């Protein structure tokens, strides 16, 4: 059976207990922590691409009100995010299983951009999700996995100073 695991869940859970925030810029900002995934149960000889997207966890705008994140009352439908292709893609199962798959180069933006960068809505809450796409073979297949531990709110600047502190302490 194909098994997908979060590397450094310990650390992600410290960010999650505070409500995690990720900066978005016009040019795009890399994530900290970086999403790293442990994968086993691939066919070492089969071909795969690793895709990353961000699900809008709810339909609301969030605001940091008197030291606490609170959702607005005017939900809007959220269009799905674009997909980031892991730059090692396409690659053999053996490649993907030999070390954690690290999405260190994805950049989060707030502006429709040349590409590479993934556009998010500021002050929305996101749940990172990967797709493992078996390619080249006759039987195309997709396995998807969400990472609740890695939920964050997209922000143009950190609201919760405890997040600011954690980000520096562990970088
Ligand atoms: C150029 C190359 C890239 C190749 C590609 N992979 C996929 C699916 C299997 C993951 N679709 O296209 C397309 C975007 N930029």
Curated annotation (Swiss-Prot):
Subcellular localization, as worded in the UniProt entry: Nucleus
DNA bind region: 11-171
Keyword Electron transport attributed: no
Tissues in which the UniProt entry reports expression: Detected in testis, but not in other, normal tissues. Detected in lung tumors (at protein level).
Keyword terms, alphabetized: Activator, Developmental protein, Disease variant, DNA-binding, Nucleus, Transcription, Transcription regulation
GO biological process, one term: mesoderm development
Residue ranges of coiled coil: none
Subunit text: Monomer.
Function field: Involved in the transcriptional regulation of genes required for mesoderm formation and differentiation. Binds to a palindromic T site 5'-TTCACACCTAGGTGTGAA-3' DNA sequence and activates gene transcription when bound to such a site.
Protein name from the UniProt record: T-box transcription factor T
Natural source organism: Homo sapiens (Human)
Higher taxonomy: Eukaryota, Metazoa, Chordata, Craniata, Vertebrata
Gene (name only): TBXT
């Amino acid at each position: 059976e194909l098994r997908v695991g979060l590397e450094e869940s310990e650390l992600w859970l410290r960010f999650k207990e505070l409500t995690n925030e990720m900066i978005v810029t016009k040019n795009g900002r890399r994530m900290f922590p970086v999403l790293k995934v442990n994968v086993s149960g691939l066919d070492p000889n089969a071909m795969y691409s690793f895709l990353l997207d961000f699900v809008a966890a709810d339909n609301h705008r969030w605001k940091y009100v008197n030291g606490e994140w609170v959702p607005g009352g005017k939900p809007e439908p959220q269009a799905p995010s674009c997909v980031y292709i892991h730059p090692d893609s396409p690659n053999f199962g053996a490649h993907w299983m030999k070390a954690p798959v690290s999405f260190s180069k994805v950049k989060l933006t707030n502006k429709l951009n040349g590409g590479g960068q993934i556009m998010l809505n500021s002050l929305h809450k996101y749940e990172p999700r990967i797709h493992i796409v078996r390619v080249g073979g006759p039987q195309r297949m997709i396995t998807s996995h969400c990472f609740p531990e890695t939920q964050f709110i997209a922000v143009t600047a950190y609201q919760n100073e405890e997040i600011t502190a954690l980000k520096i302490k562990y970088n």
